């Protein structure tokens, strides 16, 4: 018969136990059974977003028919899955596909109504096998569907339904729409208990029930891409894969060390100055110590919640994992790591440190971002530098951040260059700048520098972003910002902070510049802000430390060229003299260093005068800075 | 905010007893009143009631529609244009699930083109999208949040009853909006700023969900009554609503508490009591 | 058969020593192996802006399979590279693309789960044999993907992921996204040390290691 060639039997698969158990879905299986037993239009379609279990509802219907938990009208049905590609495949000649489809209809007539059919991806059917001599498979099943002689169960995605079936109103109305809503977190945990049994049996590991409730809860929180239970089942399954891989050869930490020692081994082999033999010896000793510990504990065998957390922290990038000791000792010394590039400015380093510490310790508000910030303070004191030190702390790279300069947004149009264009208009197909950048990388420091230069109501986009961490781009899809750090840097109290920083505490300074911002921003917007910091103007000792930072990076710039420089502290006191004024901050120091060092020094390098290898001493002249060769 | 909960409550109780007018949506509301007094929270508490989720609602943030050409983001792309086969954002998201709650968040930020679109929505329950077909809005509660009477309600809510305040802020709305769009409204409700008692109870709710976060983490907290009084007195000013409460709790509790959790200092299992020092709030272990 | 014609055996090419050595990419191949050994949805996809070495990750996995550094679950797997150009290549008659492709599905699922399938340019697979109202490669592979019987390592550019695969959200949920990071200056130096050996064997010259560290530094700094 044709049903042997072109259908694959589900109830034979359910009877031999080749289908995963189906848990919950009482309402939808009951409505599928109500709709399948009609007189005209026996046809349900299962409609819901991809991942919510529509094929699983048909497989639960097949298992309930095999177990006989259905009404008496269904005891003994066969549920046969129709594979439309297997119909289309060998139909080279004209009228071959229609012969196949008509043979299937004759055999389904001869079954005396005992066969439930099943066409997953029903949207495959509309326009299947059309040609010049088209009967299209939507125009041949249309009589057999209209008269109720065929018990087809489709299962199509909601967007695929709108695109492919509502383009054909006759075949749109042949089907009854059974909606399959996304299961919530609790229903997902029940589904994961049955599939816990099946995945434990496959991967030979043991999924602990806290890992299940972690997988459903965490993947409901930290993934907006996919839908339940599929994202939670994926966390469970990939976690069990990781545990079984650790069980197989050796854990991942010895894997890291083994790859690194073979890497640096053949890399030092390629170098045959180094600063490599030291690194290789340290990693070989670390490999020996952790292998000694692995022989001392002879390990992981179960999926706990820590494995779910590490799998989700490697899906996305959000640091959900438990803190290891290197990372935790790094993170308790947060402010020491930030004062290597931002000297002075303690209040902001305290604020930023505390926002990241609330993030990592898991006390952060899950409906808002990690922390919004408004770095006020005069020009040249460290606002943009703290954001670059944030990205260099957190992300190991200076320019690894979403930097949206708010000095291009001097008109109201240029909101559209961070939501994207609406439907119909030009840049529809590319989405926003900000929204695509977050939707790639959901854990990122979002900086909005020079924020007072923008149009006053460009910050309504930020009403949404700061309050709820969701911004809706042009095409429709909302992007989740709830794991980002939003930072806007301004200078709205420049002359006020330059004037009244003396004889005032931090609190009244914050209050007074906050009144200034109250005359600038809206009361909606300066309520969204987690913490407005106030920077302070830089003093002489601050500028001395900044001079030491800039001279260290100048030595870094001149070691690549092949030169050494030692300086005397008298010249550094001169740069502390010629690089001080309160009104312009720390850049007078930078251009004083630029002029009084790099112009005569590059003059003398390009003079054919300064031989490399000899230490360039920057002693003092009468007033200038000499560069000598000894 | 007793008046608004009465208004929304009566809208759903009019719908379930049959007495709704079936030529209109169920309730077309406009939430006025200053910042941080629970406009978006009444919308979230509705969707949590009616649908068992916080974001199970068609949340349209109206401050992304500040131009004249972003009406097409919700209606759809017109014939012969780029995103034609996907419709709009509002009409599809209703045409799937016709009994939903539509939050038109921060309504005054947009341009008045969207207000013409919502004239059709709020009066007759249909909004013909771009592909040329109606969409049934006779079953959705359309809710709009704004703060057009911010200075007026923050300054003059005292010594005035609710009706005179409603008339005064409705006059301010009449200056902002066309008479058409405020004629279609089922019920404009007016909020009021929060006193000490309201911020005290909101402080207890935010501390309950803080306890719930740390109970998920594995810790417990008992709090002193004096500690909760310092949280309620440090976070009280009438201008910013109930948000200085949230970030004051956030600072004074969650920064030193997470400081001590990350420090390897606070052992699990023990009740972390939050009692006060002279002015700070310290987390102790006994 | 069908796998002789419409696939290209990487492990034959790696075992003949015809591919480039692959250096680094440790977390990416480890998560590719963690995704390929699953029960359902065995399908990773390497995402990252073009140039970062995604085909190089899959060829590094093939060289680790041949030279024996993978776990025991992958010792002996073949890595076959599907050819989306050859499958449409002769099928102008109706059904013949689908005949070819379901022949590939038979001959792969008959291998008892031994052939790791690799499709560089997964976004070609999205709309491959989409005729005038017929079955493309997406709608055909789509039910053999979310049962784990097909081990399809995709590798698509991130921009074309958004253009072609997120347009069809079901094929989008079958593939587990493995991000591929743009490497640093230092990892680039290591990559250039192995490929220094190979390019010196090609051009009949020598390459001094200052030219490598200058090449990584200068190309990172000035070509944007
Ligand atoms: N109610 C459920 N009970 C048990 N397992 C379920 C349930 N819902 C989903 N699953 C599992 O979740 C995974 C995804 O569900 P699917 O039904 O395959 O998604 P879908 O319904 O096929 O949607 P598309 O568009 O076909 S991808 C499968 O492994 C199912 O076994
Ligand atoms: N605390 C600091 N430590 C080290 N360098 C600093 C510090 N503050 C400023 N600088 C230097 O200042 C330069 C730029 O300062 P920025 O903070 O970027 O100016 P700004 O704070 O952005 O103020 P405006 O209004 O944007 S000019 C950098 O090159 C730094 O070297
Ligand atoms: N009456 C209230 N009851 C409970 N929580 C409240 C209340 N008012 C404010 N909140 C809290 O404050 C936030 C809600 O403020 P919103 O209502 O969202 O502000 P808003 O009403 O939109 O005013 P604008 O227009 O944004 S300034 C949530 O975090 C709530 O926890
Ligand atoms: N880890 C690596 N080891 C060795 N060579 C590498 C490595 N990463 C990149 N390459 C080289 O980088 C070049 C590009 O690598 P590909 O894998 O082709 O990148 P690609 O991701 O395929 O780019 P597209 O987007 O697919 S065109 C080749 O010359 C590779 O040899």
Author numbering:
A (entry chain C): 159 to 430, 441 to 466, 527 to 858
B (entry chain D): 573 to 858
C (entry chain B): 159 to 382
Task: Reproduce, without paraphrasing, sentences from the article in which this PDB structure was first reported.
We studied the disaggregase ClpB, which contains tandem ATPase domains (AAA1, AAA2) and shifts between low and high ATPase and threading activities. ClpB is composed of tandem AAA domains (AAA1, AAA2), an N-terminal domain (NTD), and a coiled-coil regulatory M-domain, which forms a repressive belt surrounding the AAA1 ring (Carroni et al., 2014, Heuck et al., 2016, Oguchi et al., 2012). ClpB activation requires two signals: (1) interaction with the Hsp70 partner chaperone and (2) binding to substrate protein (Lee et al., 2013, Oguchi et al., 2012, Rosenzweig et al., 2013, Seyffer et al., 2012). Each AAA domain extends a flexible pore loop bearing a conserved aromatic residue, in most cases a tyrosine, which interacts with the backbone of the threading polypeptide.
We therefore made use of the derepressed ClpB-K476C M-domain mutant, which mimics the transient state of ClpB activation by Hsp70 (Oguchi et al., 2012). To allow stable substrate trapping, we used a ClpB-K476C-DWB variant and incubated it with an excess of casein in the presence of ATPγS. Substrate-bound ClpB-K476C protomers form a closed ring state and adopt an asymmetric arrangement with a right-handed spiral distortion closed by a seam between protomers A and F, as previously observed for ClpB-WT (Deville et al., 2017, Yu et al., 2018). The states were numbered according to the position of the AAA2 domain of the seam protomer F, the region undergoing the biggest conformational change and were termed KC-1, KC-2A/2B, and KC-3. In state KC-1, all six AAA2 pore loops contact the substrate with the AAA2F protomer positioned at the bottom of the spiral staircase. In the AAA1 ring, pore loops A–D are bound to the substrate, and protomers E and F are detached, with pore loop E at the top of the spiral arrangement of AAA1 loops and pore loop F in an intermediate position. In KC-1, the arginine finger of AAA1D is moderately displaced by 3 Å. This intermediate position suggests AAA1E is in an intermediate, not fully active state. In KC-1 and KC-2, the nucleotide binding pockets of AAA2B–AAA2E show clear densities for ATPγS and receive arginine fingers of their counterclockwise neighbors, defining AAA2B – AAA2E as active. In contrast, the arginine fingers of AAA2E and AAA2F shift 12-16 Å away from the nucleotide sites of AAA2F and AAA2A, respectively, defining AAA2F and AAA2A as inactive.
